[PDB]
Design a protein around this ligand. Structure first.
Ligand SMILES: [Ca+2]
Ligand SMILES: [Ca+2]
Ligand SMILES: [Ca+2]
Ligand SMILES: [Ca+2]
Lengths: 639, 639
């Protein structure tokens, strides 16, 4: 960067020189009228070139050389090291008329050189490198650079600031700035609700970290100390990317020059760093489980016992939660979603919370928490795929899936605020599915993903009414038509539901043909947007009843919504027709999954209620390890 | 795209097949219970593969081949040509039990194949090509594709729609769609205020073009005609890109299937095209002039005469406008900005209008018009550079420059709405300068650009107080100190302003040293952001007086704001000190510019007022030819 500094005659100009710039210096304006030539001297640590027309020549500290005075003959002045108390850094120009060789006047330039750099970890290794040349930009991908900020998901103490990003103002210079200069850190009004910055204003008096930039504070004057100094700041993000906020914020430092009273200070030098606030990222079922969270009523004993036995087969821990006045019976699934954020220096799991009635809980200090209508707003209506490649385009973090209705239908849709939030995170590139054919309207009622043990591959599991009818028709042909469903549920007994009773119900057949069309519409979108073929899909038998809105609810428990812990699957117990004293639905599902090395455990969540009307009274959610792939290595499509 | 279609037994499924897709077909669900094997027949134009486990084999129209019934054995069904009235397109599956070789049941699939494609000019040649594979995306650059829409800047007539973009729905098929299908064109609610779409709904009754999509109309059912048909639509943009609008809009067509009463129609097939709305683009002084627009009071005779003589030296046309009650004296410069928009098929100049008091004119049908506070909001405070390359980064359309104040100053700034509009056009990548040291606060008071004749290069012209003081001090040394300014302006005479009187005014010297600092701050930003060196800059003598706000107004007319018509420059007449009966300011300026092949004509806009107090009462603006470089060939940085 070249900067303009002009001489003024009979006199001296004093200026601060910031390393990394250079000065171009007009010597002609300060020449007395009628002067013809000029000569110059300079000190050891100032480099001076005479530039005539654009041709530059280095000039010695004390030569006698003279040049013609011309507007097109100027000086270029460079310094490679900061001034100290031992410095006298200067350039002096003498002017001559035609008459003789003794100077008729002289104009000086007295310089104080300082280093000023606002530094961040732009190369994304967790250390704050010195003046990264790319620190003022932010680029995606393996070769990308620029600093990363975490949203704070929770006078201050240093220990509390350990999660934040470091920003260091590094300076070098003499004991003090020359008269009339100050250094100021600042942000835009727009960015003021996106960030906050802390530091210790008075280190002589203690370690107290104070908030110096943020809401209502757009600038902070910083104290200059001489020699080589560093000021350590901590920076936090205040919010995630959203519809109107890209995720990018900037922080500036300027050296300002005092002009006079009632005149703004002049920005002599400005340095800028950019941060991107890390997005919230969802974890698919293929990622290693850490903890399993369940909620149910205290007396659903079978559910608790069987979930405990499932989890005991794994290395996961179980966390048991009961029911709360402000929350639905499924809240750990519906009102809570486990996700994470990551920066080069650190990362943590982050839970999104959307309580049914609003807040009045939480599990653990280890998580960050973000707290916020139709049933489509539930997190049961949100899923995320394993990493996929689609027509050459890779989604290394997978893609988020959200249930919706058809564009022209006038049906339900998840609220714009949530849809826009998910879209703005960018790295999971969400896809809308069709859930509005279901009374409750959640994608988790019809689909899930499971890893294939011993491989890096996965399966999509789809509810299928067609598979259920085929199975029941086979068992009827085999002489089992009188086999009864719901054995052991006393509140169902008087209905005497048998395979025969189901197969002879004409309207129910028609309803379920229609529901299969809805499932297949989803199947096609999933194959398209996830790059899946028929070999990647398994169909689990399912059956629904229709309401007055022509929407589906489960006839028997939906097996697709299962607890996935690697090879081990907690599968809702279906209570299907018994053949040879085994549920034909359980046997069929085992025959599909077990050959792939998946281990099935059926979990009874409904017996405690004595009947099943389509509603499930328990919920589960699994906290998983984050992806090994760093989100900042992705190259998302430009919006 | 693979689509799911299942057979149903004892019976027939009828389906529409859209060319470009294929069907995967479950034959197992329709098998009677206890059936073992299946065979198939099909018609000549339907291609059928039996896919077992993922291994596919082509099957003849009538073979006797049998396969085991399995859920993992399916059909893949393809058609390469649309159905006609002569078509019977079908696949029939026979089922067998173990017992014998005579079919126990059969399930058919009856198909009607149609072509449906929503087509636009995505390859950007002005013609609407057939089904561009990239039409659903929009990419920048020489190799980029996707369609371009113009904002409309002005029952309907076809002639009025000639400027709009064409979109053509191309279909092929038999006399009618099968029962229960319709084709619907649609847009999102969000896009509904960004676009409008027209067509002739009833071509049997006349040519009337009606608005079918836009505000309050999100969908339109289109009539299907058989054979090969095209429906021609015209599409207009309603607004330019802005803070919350990227410029991208989408239009969809869907084939919908009727399910039953009170159930939404199912989207069987959807095709999508994307448009980008073309940005408003500003023209720098290096572009060929077409017309010169001037405004002044009717009796400023010298101005009109001299501007006419200037324009007569060129091939440009002159347009003379007077003063209006709702507008300032400079309005053609301050309230009007000439720009253009372009699409592959066509382009036109587009004027932005921001009337001082609001609207109550316009010049010509040839222009589009866009009509909308401090003095920084004026278009005198907007300039655009010639094309530049900066540190390897090219700006082929140049960069817009807007005057502002320092970030921490609390000073004036152009309104956010205008700043955000300019930023959203993206292709001119605006730069903020510092104009707030001037009372009026316009960049055109201190800077301009001129082409260097006979070359592709250009110069930045900067006002310089330092150049004026040097010149006046020289003339004083030469014995001309008593030379008077403002000769011939009777209202100035009693002041007796001479070079001596100016040079002895101590406070004025100090004021102008400060103004030179302001100019130099701008010089440095311009060199940085435009990639300019000192060789690219010429300094024109200028002088200012300071107001109580410490802001500058011209002491004598600012020569930098000049009419640039290629080699010929209309330069405000300065009324400087006369030496040997020539203005020393005019002679100095000629000595700077003329050697470069620039021809200077000085234009007197102030004599009619008898004095000069810092205010100019005339304005000029030049309409120029657009850049030859197509804006869509640029690759702007991602936001
Ligand atoms: Ca680093
Ligand atoms: Ca979920
Ligand atoms: Ca074309
Ligand atoms: Ca302008």
């Amino acid at each position: 960067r070249e900067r303009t500094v002009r001489l003024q005659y009979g006199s001296r100009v004093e200026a601060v020189y910031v390393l990394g710039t250079y000065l171009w210096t007009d010597v002609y304006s300060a020449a007395p009228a009628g002067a013809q030539t000029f000569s110059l001297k300079h000190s050891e640590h100032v480099w001076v070139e005479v530039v005539r027309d654009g041709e530059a020549e280095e000039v010695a500290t004390n030569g006698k050389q003279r040049w013609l005075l011309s507007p097109s003959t100027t000086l270029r002045v460079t310094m490679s090291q900061a001034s100290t108390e031992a410095s006298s850094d200067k350039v002096t120009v003498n002017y001559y008329d035609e008459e003789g060789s003794i100077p008729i006047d002289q104009a000086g330039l007295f310089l104080t050189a300082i280093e000023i750099s606002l530094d961040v970890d732009a190369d994304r290794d967790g250390v704050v490198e010195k003046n990264n040349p790319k620190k003022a930009s932010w680029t995606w991908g393996p070769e990308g650079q620029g600093a990363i900020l975490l949203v704070n998901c929770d006078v201050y103490s240093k220990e509390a600031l350990k999660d934040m990003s470091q920003m260091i103002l590094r300076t070098k210079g003499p004991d003090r700035l020359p008269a009339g200069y100050e250094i100021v850190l600042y942000i835009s009004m727009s960015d003021s609700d996106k960030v906050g910055v802390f530091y210790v204003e008075n280190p002589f008096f203690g370690q107290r970290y104070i908030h110096i930039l943020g809401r209502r504070k757009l600038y902070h004057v910083v104290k200059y100390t001489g020699g080589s100094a560093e000021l350590l700041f901590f920076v936090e993000g205040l919010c995630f990317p959203d519809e109107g906020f890209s995720g990018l914020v900037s922080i500036h430092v300027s050296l300002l020059e005092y002009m006079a009273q009632d005149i703004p200070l002049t920005p002599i030098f400005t340095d800028t760093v950019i941060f991107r606030i890390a997005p919230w990222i969802m974890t698919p079922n293929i990622l290693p489980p850490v903890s399993v969270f369940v909620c149910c009523m205290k007396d659903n004993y079978l559910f608790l016992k069987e979930v405990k036995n499932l989890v005991e087969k794994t290395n996961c821990e179980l966390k048991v939660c009961f029911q709360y006045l402000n929350r639905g019976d499924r809240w750990i699934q519906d009102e809570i979603e486990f996700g994470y954020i990551e920066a080069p220096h650190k990362g943590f799991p982050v839970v999104l919370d959307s309580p049914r009635d609003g807040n009045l809980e939480l599990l653990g200090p280890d998580f960050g928490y973000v707290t916020r209508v139709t049933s489509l707003d539930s997190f049961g209506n949100l899923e995320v795929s394993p990493p996929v490649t689609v027509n050459g385009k890779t989604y290394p973090l997978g893609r988020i899936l959200i249930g919706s209705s058809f564009p022209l239908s006038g049906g339900r849709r998840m609220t714009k605020v949530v849809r826009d939030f998910l879209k703005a995170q960018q790295v999971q590139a969400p896809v809308e599915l069709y859930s509005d054919w279901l009374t409750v309207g959640h994608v988790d009622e019809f689909m899930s993903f499971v890893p294939i043990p011993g491989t890096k591959k996965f399966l999509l599991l789809m509810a299928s009414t067609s598979a259920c009818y085929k199975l029941f028709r086979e068992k009827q042909k085999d002489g089992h038509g009188e086999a009864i469903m719901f054995k052991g549920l006393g509140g169902m007994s008087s209905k005497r539901i048998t395979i025969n009773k189901i197969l002879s119900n004409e309207s129910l057949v028609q309803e379920n043909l229609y529901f299969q069309r809805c499932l297949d519409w989803n199947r096609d979108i999933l194959k398209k947007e996830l790059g899946l073929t028929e070999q990647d899909i398994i169909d689990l038998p399912a059956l629904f009843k229709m309401d007055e809105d022509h929407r589906a609810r489960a006839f028997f428990p939906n097996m697709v919504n299962m607890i996935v812990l690697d090879k081990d699957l907690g599968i809702p117990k279906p209570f299907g027709p018994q053949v040879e004293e085994e549920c034909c639905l359980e046997m069929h599902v085992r025959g599909l999954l077990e050959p792939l090395g998946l281990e099935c455990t059926f979990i009874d969540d409904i017996s405690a209620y004595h009947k099943f009307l389509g509603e499930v009274h328990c919920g589960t959610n699994v906290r998983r390890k984050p992806f090994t792939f760093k989100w900042w290595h992705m190259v998302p499509s430009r919006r």
